[PDB]
């Protein structure tokens, strides 16, 4: 269900993120541990042994010492822990102690969903966010050419029938964005769209 590790890696590299990309990880992604280059990762909420559950993106901007955590659903940390049994405080601590002279960092995260509740497109939305991040690392969540294509909806409305048109339109815009930007996606488009469909789940 949803995108494989290799699909995500191929697409993120089509999107120009290869130099920065630490790889597709399970929930044990260790963090941002050395040097001063822009960095990013795609991280599952679950361990590899489970077969995977949900995809998140992380970005690290060394200039500002800002870590971005992008959940396509925009869940809070408390809700990621409750729903997905996923916590990432240890990774942030590790990263701050490795990279920041004052043992601090800034954490920016979404409060809104771009994705329908039954969609299997989370990893693809993560790739789209990472394109925004590597091209506009000081303002990836909104107010850039990539994320301006999507409409965020309050996370608390995720299960409402009133938002389904908006969330489906986001998915259609995601696929058109990927078709413009990714030869991998173009070559496998029908299959990937089936596998990641809005009502898949």
């Amino acid at each position: 269900s949803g995108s494989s590790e290799q699909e995500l890696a191929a697409i993120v590299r089509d999107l120009g993120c290869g130099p920065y990309f630490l790889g597709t990880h399970d929930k044990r992604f260790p963090g941002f541990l050395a040097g001063n280059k822009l960095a990013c990762a795609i991280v599952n909420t679950a361990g590899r042994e489970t077969g995977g559950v949900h995809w998140l993106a992380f970005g690290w901007n060394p200039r500002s010492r800002t870590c971005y955590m992008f959940d396509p659903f925009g869940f809070s940390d408390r809700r990621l822990k409750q729903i997905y049994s996923f916590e990432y405080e240890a990774m942030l601590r590790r990263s701050a102690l490795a990279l920041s002279p004052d043992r601090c960092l800034s954490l920016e995260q979404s409060t809104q969903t771009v994705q329908g509740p039954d969609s299997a497109a989370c990893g693809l939305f993560c790739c789209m966010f990472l394109h925004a991040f590597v091209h506009w690392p000081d303002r990836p969540m909104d107010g850039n050419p990539t994320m301006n294509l999507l409409t965020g909806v309050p996370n608390g409305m995720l299960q409402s029938p009133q938002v389904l048109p908006t969330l489906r339109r986001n998915q259609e815009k995601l696929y058109r964005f990927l078709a413009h930007h990714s030869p991998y996606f173009r070559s496998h488009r029908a299959a990937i769209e089936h596998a990641t469909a809005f009502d898949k789940m």
Binding site: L97, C104, S106, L107, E108, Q109, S110, T111, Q112
Partner: peptide, 10 residues
């Protein structure tokens, strides 16, 4: 998306 940015110190 709307977002929140918080400072975390360790």
């Amino acid at each position: 998306v709307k977002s929140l940015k918080r400072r975390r110190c360790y």
